[PDB]
Amino acid sequence: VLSMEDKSNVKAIWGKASGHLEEYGAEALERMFCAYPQTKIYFPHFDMSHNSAQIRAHGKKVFSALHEAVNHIDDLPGALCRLSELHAHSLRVDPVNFKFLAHCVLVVFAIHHPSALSPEIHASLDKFLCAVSAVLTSKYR
Amino acid sequence: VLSMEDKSNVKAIWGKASGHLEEYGAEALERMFCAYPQTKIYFPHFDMSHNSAQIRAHGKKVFSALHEAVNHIDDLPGALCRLSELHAHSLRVDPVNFKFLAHCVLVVFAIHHPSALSPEIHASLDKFLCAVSAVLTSKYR
Amino acid sequence: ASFDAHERKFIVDLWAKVDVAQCGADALSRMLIVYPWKRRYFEHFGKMCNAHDILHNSKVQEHGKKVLASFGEAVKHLDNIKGHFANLSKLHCEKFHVDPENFKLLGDIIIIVLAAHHPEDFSVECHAAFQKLVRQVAAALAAEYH
Amino acid sequence: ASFDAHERKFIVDLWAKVDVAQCGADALSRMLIVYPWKRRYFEHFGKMCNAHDILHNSKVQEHGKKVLASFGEAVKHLDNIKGHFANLSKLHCEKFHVDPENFKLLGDIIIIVLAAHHPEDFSVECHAAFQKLVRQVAAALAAEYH
Ligand code: HEM
Ligand code: HEM
Ligand code: HEM
Ligand code: HEM
């Protein structure tokens, strides 16, 4: 469960990514494909070159979805309902993969906002990304 | 999320344990202490002999709590609120341990009710025990 | 660790009573029903939309026989489990692309299948000897992952 | 796998710029704040009720220095990580009783600490070389668990 303090912490750190959703999202995907190359099997059709149009476009959708989740942090199951059906039922993504992407998102915030991602903010943002991941692996059938 | 079919499956299999809460709970603890000996560090004060009074008494409390969770399967966060504070905040039990006990509960139902624990019932009961475990590791602070 | 003489007796005496074809078919079917993302790795075996499809799929049934026969070779190489499974570790990593956390989940489903088929034999101490075997086989199948 | 020459250059060049005492104190503090159950393993270091207590605990600060200095010996034994860490694996298993899943969580927190302290250096390829190191050290610390 995310507390009131966690919810304010997540909103504050997420506001730093305003204006940067495509850039930060592209970087988070590029770091996941490089550091965890086993995730590339989900994206056989992608050009995996640096700043490819497919990776920038996909990165922007991922971060846009996270941005909507931050705005609806009191009801993540409702905000992420369609995406949970896509990942769990249609794509059958192995749940271990949500941990790899959540880690690459934290690394992107540590690089761009190192002082803003203090130990308490890190704890809140880690709690938020686990909560998102739990909604996205909730519909396997 | 547990479906309507999952909820009926969990109620049906749990009804087999009626009358046996102390026995099945004692067996689930004895199997966790033997198969996963690292869990014994939480219970330094216990007599670890077979059918010890402490293990029978503790087993009965665990299964009684699970029995109440089955009866309140639509609101597990509310039914298990006090127990989540005890395990996460007061005892600081490492979350890996909830998987060991959930596995030992399934083994106890496979031994006593092998035909009742069919593949679809197994899937429902595994989903219920993950849901219980998720409420009990939700309050680490 | 090494298996002691009591753990070995438990494992050898029980394995001799196991119907490997039946238990293997059951175990593979249960893992695809209980952990549905695992169906992606096997999508060449056909459609696996639901438990009914999985229980009636002859390819799933035949593959589960081979997997538990392979697992049962551990019982004859208890001193050398990592070395016996190194090629199969490589094959899972490179050809099948299976995430190594999944090996622990199938080991937990084999314990359940054995418990249900041999309840009088699957004592507290017998279970503990088998929990150590499945933990070592799952580790050996994860070992050539690079 | 073995580290190739490009992975080695990334790891060696970056480690030479790391303030190990500062990074180690930061990493240990963050793991107790982000994963609060880990406080149980250290309950002899004092009360760790909240992040303020943890950030001002001199024992936590000094221990984190030793842990990252120890981790940094991997950089000089890239060919022999499992063998270099076998005693420390035994000590964690038998004396400290630490569950081996926790080693992966501290490796992920070291990546974050390095990323924040060295952002221009922690390129996509540098991160991937360090992700392979922390995965091997975490595996070496889990290896003498029996
Ligand atoms: C924070 C976690 C995640 C979020 C918020 C997220 C979000 C999204 C969104 C918004 C889409 C686009 C859907 C649409 O266009 O309607 C998508 C598609 C997809 N996602 Fe994710 N995702 C996440 C994690 C992952 C992970 C871990 C994987 C696999 C490693 C993955 C694999 C895919 C794939 C393969 C597609 C389809 C892409 C295509 O067809 O071009 N996602 N995701
Ligand atoms: C299904 C999961 C679990 C349930 C439903 C459960 C339930 C309970 C209950 C009902 C109590 C008694 C509280 C009271 O008397 O007010 C208790 C105490 C406790 N539980 Fe659990 N528990 C679970 C899992 C675990 C696990 C995984 C561990 C550690 C490996 C654990 C360690 C303890 C300990 C150490 C106590 C205190 C015992 C004492 O002081 O004698 N529990 N639990
Ligand atoms: C006890 C653990 C395991 C054992 C002993 C085992 C053994 C085997 C064997 C013997 C084969 C046949 C190799 C060949 O000659 O081509 C195989 C294939 C395969 N295994 Fe496993 N396996 C295990 C666990 C798993 C798990 C957990 C997964 C995925 C969730 C998996 C996925 C596969 C796949 C996808 C194939 C290829 C199927 C085919 O093309 O016929 N295995 N395994
Ligand atoms: C990168 C991973 C790790 C390394 C390199 C490492 C290294 C060390 C070292 C060098 C010591 C001192 C040994 C001695 O001379 O007594 C130690 C002690 C200890 N470590 Fe770790 N460690 C790691 C991960 C962890 C994790 C994840 C935990 C628990 C969450 C943990 C818990 C402990 C505990 C409880 C002690 C004893 C503390 C004391 O009594 O001073 N370690 N570790």
Author numbering:
A (entry chain A), B (entry chain A): 1 to 141
C (entry chain B), D (entry chain B): 1 to 146
Can I see the authors' text?
Hemoglobins (Hbs) from all jawed vertebrates form similar hetero-tetramers, with two *α* and two *β* subunits. Hb is present at enormous concentration within the red blood cell, over 300 mg/mL in the case of humans for example, to facilitate oxygen transport around the body. The change between these two quaternary structures of Hb can be described approximately as a rigid rotation of one *αβ* dimer relative to the other by about 15°, giving a different pattern of hydrogen bond interactions between the subunits. The MWC model explains the cooperative binding of oxygen by low affinity of the T state, which is stabilized by intersubunit bonds that oppose oxygen binding, so that the less contrained R state shows higher ligand affinity and is preferred at higher oxygen saturation.
CO-bound crocodile Hb showed the R conformation and, unexpectedly, a smaller population of molecules in a T-like conformation. A map with resolution 2.33 Å was obtained from 434,265 particles, and the refined model shows a dimer rotation angle of 15.1°. One more round of heterogeneous refinement and non-uniform refinement for each class produced the final maps for R (371,597 particles and 2.22 Å resolution) and T-like forms (238,763 particles and 2.38 Å resolution). Bonds characteristic of the R conformation (such as between Asp *α*_1_94 and Asn *β*_2_102) are found in the new HbAM R model, but not in the T-like conformation. In the HbAM R model, Asp *α*94 also interacts with Tyr *β*41, a residue unique to crocodilian Hbs ([Fig fig3]). This interaction is not found in human HbA, where residue *β*41 is replaced by the generally conserved phenylalanine. The amino acid substitution Glu *β*39 → Arg, unique to crocodilian Hbs, appears to favour the R conformation over R2. Arg *β*39, associated with the bicarbonate binding effect of crocodilian Hbs, appears to be largely responsible for the preference of liganded HbAM to adopt the R conformation. In the case of crocodilian Hb, the R2 conformation is absent, and residue changes around the bicarbonate binding site strongly favour the R conformation over R2. This provides clear proof that the allosteric mechanism of Hb does not rely on the R2 conformation, merely breakage of intersubunit bonds specific to the T-state.
